[PDB]
Amino acid sequence: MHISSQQHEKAIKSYFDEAQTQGVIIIKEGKNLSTYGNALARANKEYVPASTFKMLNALIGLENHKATTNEIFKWDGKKRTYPAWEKDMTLGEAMALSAVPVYQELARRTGLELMQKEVKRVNFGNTNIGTQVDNFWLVGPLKITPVQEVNFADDLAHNRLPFKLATQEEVKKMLLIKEVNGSKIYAKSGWGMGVTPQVGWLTGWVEQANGKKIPFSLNLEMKEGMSGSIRNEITYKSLENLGII
Ligand SMILES: *[B]([O])([O])C1=[C][C]=[C]C([N]C(=O)OC([C])([C])[C])=[C]1
């Protein structure tokens, strides 16, 4: 509309600056990528995917019959970092809670050889999973750029990934995080705990009421003390500033 690009860029930059971190949000409209934020050079830099990999882990596990969407993964009874992980849950529940143990079990079911084949087949990030099937998305060697993440989101949103349609639809159902006046936001957060500096992600898309899908990827540095919700807050403020929601 009437707001200048200068003003949108200043606003979105300010959301990162006010959080006292450095980051970017990339938005894709059709084929065009737009880069906003306070550290634009991050757009083509590699970071661990962290829990954003759960989207791909789920696609792989479902496609390869290593789980179903109704299967309840039982809690083993051992102490976890958060109480919400000390419970039985499905893949979709684990997606929302970013329950690493569930997705480590899924990864171990898939196994190293198949996992590597599938990550290569999808062309995800640097494509390298190394030798440890249960943490390769967390500590390396798998890495991905924000441009690659928004492009993955665009692929999933439009059922373009090399998986069955129904596999993609199943995973997409797991990713609904917010509804805002008629728009739906599908996304997965990431937080690279135990990498340094720590990366934060929120990668997904907006499905507008008219059916248009607008992929995005937020990437920032998570600082001591920071709440995970800052990823969501910056994302929503940016999308709102641009009129996408
Ligand atoms: B994900 O939301 O980025 C996520 C959830 C839980 C835990 C981790 N990372 C993690 O446990 O990393 C090690 C390095 C294994 C402590 C990430």
Ligand SMILES: O=C[C@H](O)CO
């Ligand atoms: O990393 C530190 C902050 O961006 C300072 O305002």
Ligand SMILES: O=C[C@H](O)CO
């Ligand atoms: O940039 C994105 C492509 O999707 C991966 O090489």
